[PDB]
Amino acid sequence: MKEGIHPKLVPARIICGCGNVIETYSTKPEIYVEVCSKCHPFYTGQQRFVDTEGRVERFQRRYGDSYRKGR
Amino acid sequence: MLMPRRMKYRKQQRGRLKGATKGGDYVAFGDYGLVALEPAWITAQQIEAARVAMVRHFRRGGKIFIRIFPDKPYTKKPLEVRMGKGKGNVEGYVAVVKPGRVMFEVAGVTEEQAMEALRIAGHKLPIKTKIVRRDAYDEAQ
Amino acid sequence: KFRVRNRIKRTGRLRLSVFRSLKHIYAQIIDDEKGVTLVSASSLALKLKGNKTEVARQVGRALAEKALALGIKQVAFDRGPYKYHGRVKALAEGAREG
Amino acid sequence: GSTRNGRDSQAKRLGVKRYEGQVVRAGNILVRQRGTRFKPGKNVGMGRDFTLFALVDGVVEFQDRGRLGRYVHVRPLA
Amino acid sequence: DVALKRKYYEEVRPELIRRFGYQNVWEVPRLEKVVINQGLGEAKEDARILEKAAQELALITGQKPAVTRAKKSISNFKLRKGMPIGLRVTLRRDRMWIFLEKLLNVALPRIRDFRGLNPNSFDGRGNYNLGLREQLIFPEITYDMVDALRGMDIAVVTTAETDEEARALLELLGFPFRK
Amino acid sequence: VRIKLLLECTECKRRNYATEKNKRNTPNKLELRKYCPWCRKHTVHREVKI
RNA sequence: CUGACUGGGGCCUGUAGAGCACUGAUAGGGCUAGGGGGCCCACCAGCCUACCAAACCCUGUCAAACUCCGAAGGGUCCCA
RNA sequence: GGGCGGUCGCCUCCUAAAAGGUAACGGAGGCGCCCAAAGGUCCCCUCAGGCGGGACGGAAAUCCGCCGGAGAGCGCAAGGGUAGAAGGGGGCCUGACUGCGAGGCCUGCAAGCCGAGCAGGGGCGAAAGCCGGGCCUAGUGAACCGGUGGUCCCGUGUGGA
RNA sequence: UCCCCCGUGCCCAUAGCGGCGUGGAACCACCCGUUCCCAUUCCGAACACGGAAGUGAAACGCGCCAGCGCCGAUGGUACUGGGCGGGCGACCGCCUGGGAGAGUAGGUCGGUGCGGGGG
Ligand SMILES: [Mg+2]
Ligand SMILES: [Mg+2]
Ligand SMILES: [Mg+2]
Ligand SMILES: [Mg+2]
Ligand SMILES: [Mg+2]
Ligand SMILES: [Mg+2]
Ligand SMILES: [Mg+2]
Ligand SMILES: [Mg+2]
Ligand SMILES: [Mg+2]
Ligand SMILES: [Mg+2]
Ligand SMILES: [Mg+2]
Ligand SMILES: [Mg+2]
Ligand SMILES: [Mg+2]
Ligand SMILES: [Mg+2]
Ligand SMILES: [Mg+2]
Ligand SMILES: [Mg+2]
Ligand SMILES: [Mg+2]
Ligand SMILES: [Mg+2]
């Protein structure tokens, strides 16, 4: 036990982001968002940054056919 | 020459030369062996003078085997110095050998060339050292 | 390989051995360098009471009256694996007196 | 060119002073030992410098047997 | 009390049957202890010891960790005897699951790296140091006592022998895979 | 020698001494001690400058 | 009648001898932490080292200040 | 041979010939100290390394598991011994007492060392039991002349000094 | 008058190490909790207390496996009191007794007391 420096860990409720958070143990009730953020086989939780969010007029096929004109 | 690179103590004693061999009679490495017969010391100059007299004698084949190692420092006082006042300086490490111990063992050298080579290196040593060949006198069961 | 071995000193040459299992306890009194157990009082060999720490009073009176019945007084006490805490088997007869 | 080291300590002169099969009195030193080469048995006491002596008088006996060290046993006479 | 205990009892104990295990009662693998260490971070954060990681650590899991000594004065890293530098704690109870279910669900998001951690960090006899980097940003602590990066180190010790028998447990308990 | 400050402990009420040191370098300043006198039967003892 | 010495019983040692399990040096052989390094490759995605070499295991050794071992003897005590 | 140089005391190992002793201007080294805890009692734990890992990390900081029986440590050089503690951690205390001390080791003598136990009064432990300093061997100096406290013993006819 | 298990011993690695079995009705261990007497540089892991619904997985006992380790015989010298000789020396030879250490055969994974429980 050792009552003393060891606190009682007063109950406080977290804001229940991804289902029910593991319940009232610590007095820190605040997260940013999205406790799990995915089901955790990591189902492509993307926010479409500098990579292929803009896919029009680049990473495309322009300037004619599939380039039979080569030789 | 050669010398042991590390020692517990620098100087040590002499002792006696009795006892038969305390190991080192069976060859177990080569096909021949130069075996001693009289108790004496083997200086590193006697090791070098007998080791050069093999590689300069026979060439291009035959590995030479030495089974002697000097760990006894020969202690000699400087010249024109009276007695006492501590021990002398260390000049060259010597190797104690017993009679019936095999010192030099040629490898890959035939009969008529190994008898000659061990005969040349036999005169570099102050000991009556006869020559033995590979026999069935091993320590196997 | 845990052992404390408070049984190693043996200045007093006559000790009371104590074994506490997790179910019940039992105790003996040994005579040293001879290997003869004089008297003993064992729970579930005489099956005195169910609660394991309430055993110590009745086996203290029982082993005390059997020790005085066998006529040995100057005894001792071991503490080999266990702390002197919880069960005490305190007595007021026999020279252990604790 | 002088003598480097030529001094030596005076011997403290340890050793076994009472062998077994010897009648002793209460207080005889059984062995003067440097370290505890002998472990106390019955009626044997140690001192400051690991010296063990007899507590009672009688015929002494060694080597009850090993696995912990050599034993000294001052056995009384009956 | 109960914190993902249904995933502890009917997602582990019958799941370790028909493909793993010798299917008696106790050689099915389970959790014995999960040690957690500070180890000063990089080096000594101060010349004199300050004992505040016991306070924010007692905030995040509500218990004081023992500040233990140092070894022989090698003095290449100004090593010394005394003035304890340990900050180690095991604390195995249901209080283990009180904090381990918090960091089990809060630490895999809310810190940025490649998605997850090594399945090659398993060791012999199944004791598995997992080794998170820092987490003083979002262990829901709100920047309390920002001295340095000041991470910690976790080892979740299983019971069974092989890495396939701890690997049988841990990502069926919810760990990531292939870094 | 010259660090030990070898001294003797006084009766702290009447007369005797006990002859044991107390270091001046390490701050072992004004160390109380109980010791056995002859007449006063295990009273307290303190230092003296000699 | 205890003595020098001798016979019957114990106890003790670490010398001769022997040995490498301990403390060090060691003639080779195998394995190769790694290092001038790398044939030279989007660097780890290698390959043999006829380059060096840590540590380990064998065939072999040496020791007054090494002993896992260990006499012949000597000392001591009881009886004759 | 003397002078020059080195040494003069104590401890450790060998020389040293298996009891003890044993020399040389023989070899290898240390000391003129230190700890109110580095002491006593009581209660817990077993080390150093190697392997598999780590978040920084030298291949040594700190943590986990296995192997590891003593190759670590025990203030200090070396030897002995030690985990069935003398080693590391914590509580309480100062026996780091006073009067003695049977019986001994060794010694030419002087010295040096062990000391069960008796009384008074303690400390620790519930007790059994231990404690008259330090795990041990070096860390010192006979005698004479005086210094500081107590003792009120003598104090030169008497009382005092 | 016998087997199994638990305490406590003596033999001092022929007792251990490593692998393979096996046992809980019967003790013992494991386990479920901590509520108080108790505790942790931190934690009921180890001490402590209620138990005991589940178990012999781990540990613990018994049984097997000689390689791992250990013990290790008869001869044979090395060595040596004691006596007699040789060699210029380094050092050797004979007799009388004594008698190793390695190595080889082989042995072993225990032997034997006291007090309790069950049949
Ligand atoms: Mg053990
Ligand atoms: Mg203990
Ligand atoms: Mg215990
Ligand atoms: Mg007579
Ligand atoms: Mg006589
Ligand atoms: Mg005789
Ligand atoms: Mg020798
Ligand atoms: Mg020899
Ligand atoms: Mg004899
Ligand atoms: Mg001697
Ligand atoms: Mg002699
Ligand atoms: Mg101490
Ligand atoms: Mg103790
Ligand atoms: Mg005298
Ligand atoms: Mg000390
Ligand atoms: Mg007058
Ligand atoms: Mg007058
Ligand atoms: Mg000559």
CSV table of N, CA, C and O (backbone and C1' of nucleotides) and ligand atoms in Angstrom, one decimal, chain G residues 2-6 76-80, ligand 5:
chain,number,residue,atom,x,y,z
G,2,U,P,58.6,-45.0,31.5
G,2,U,O5',58.5,-43.4,31.3
G,2,U,C5',59.4,-42.7,30.5
G,2,U,C4',59.4,-41.2,30.8
G,2,U,C3',60.3,-40.3,29.9
G,2,U,O3',59.7,-40.0,28.7
G,2,U,C1',60.5,-39.7,32.2
G,3,G,P,60.6,-40.1,27.3
G,3,G,O5',62.0,-39.5,27.8
G,3,G,C5',62.3,-38.1,27.7
G,3,G,C4',63.7,-37.8,27.5
G,3,G,C3',64.3,-38.3,26.2
G,3,G,O3',64.2,-37.4,25.2
G,3,G,C1',65.7,-39.0,28.0
G,4,A,P,63.7,-37.9,23.7
G,4,A,O5',65.0,-38.2,22.9
G,4,A,C5',65.9,-37.2,22.6
G,4,A,C4',67.2,-37.8,22.1
G,4,A,C3',67.0,-38.8,21.0
G,4,A,O3',66.9,-38.2,19.7
G,4,A,C1',68.5,-39.7,22.6
G,5,C,P,65.5,-38.3,18.8
G,5,C,O5',65.6,-39.8,18.3
G,5,C,C5',66.7,-40.3,17.6
G,5,C,C4',66.9,-41.8,17.7
G,5,C,C3',65.7,-42.6,17.2
G,5,C,O3',65.6,-42.8,15.8
G,5,C,C1',66.4,-43.4,19.3
G,6,U,P,64.2,-42.8,15.1
G,6,U,O5',63.6,-44.3,15.5
G,6,U,C5',64.3,-45.4,15.1
G,6,U,C4',63.8,-46.7,15.8
G,6,U,C3',62.3,-47.0,15.6
G,6,U,O3',62.0,-47.6,14.4
G,6,U,C1',62.9,-47.2,17.9
G,76,U,P,58.7,-33.0,18.6
G,76,U,O5',57.2,-33.0,18.9
G,76,U,C5',56.5,-31.8,19.2
G,76,U,C4',55.0,-32.0,19.1
G,76,U,C3',54.5,-33.1,20.0
G,76,U,O3',54.3,-32.7,21.4
G,76,U,C1',53.5,-33.3,17.9
G,77,C,P,54.9,-33.7,22.5
G,77,C,O5',53.6,-34.6,22.9
G,77,C,C5',52.4,-34.0,23.4
G,77,C,C4',51.2,-34.9,23.1
G,77,C,C3',51.3,-36.3,23.6
G,77,C,O3',50.9,-36.4,25.0
G,77,C,C1',50.5,-36.3,21.4
G,78,C,P,51.6,-37.5,25.9
G,78,C,O5',50.8,-38.9,25.6
G,78,C,C5',49.4,-39.0,26.0
G,78,C,C4',48.9,-40.3,25.6
G,78,C,C3',49.8,-41.5,26.0
G,78,C,O3',49.7,-41.9,27.3
G,78,C,C1',48.9,-41.8,23.8
G,79,C,P,51.0,-42.5,28.0
G,79,C,O5',51.1,-44.0,27.5
G,79,C,C5',50.2,-45.0,27.8
G,79,C,C4',50.4,-46.3,27.1
G,79,C,C3',51.7,-46.9,27.2
G,79,C,O3',51.9,-47.7,28.4
G,79,C,C1',51.2,-46.9,24.9
G,80,A,P,53.3,-47.8,29.1
G,80,A,O5',54.1,-48.7,28.2
G,80,A,C5',53.8,-50.1,28.1
G,80,A,C4',54.7,-50.8,27.0
G,80,A,C3',56.2,-50.7,27.1
G,80,A,O3',56.7,-51.6,28.0
G,80,A,C1',55.5,-50.2,24.9
J,5,MG,MG,59.8,-38.2,23.3
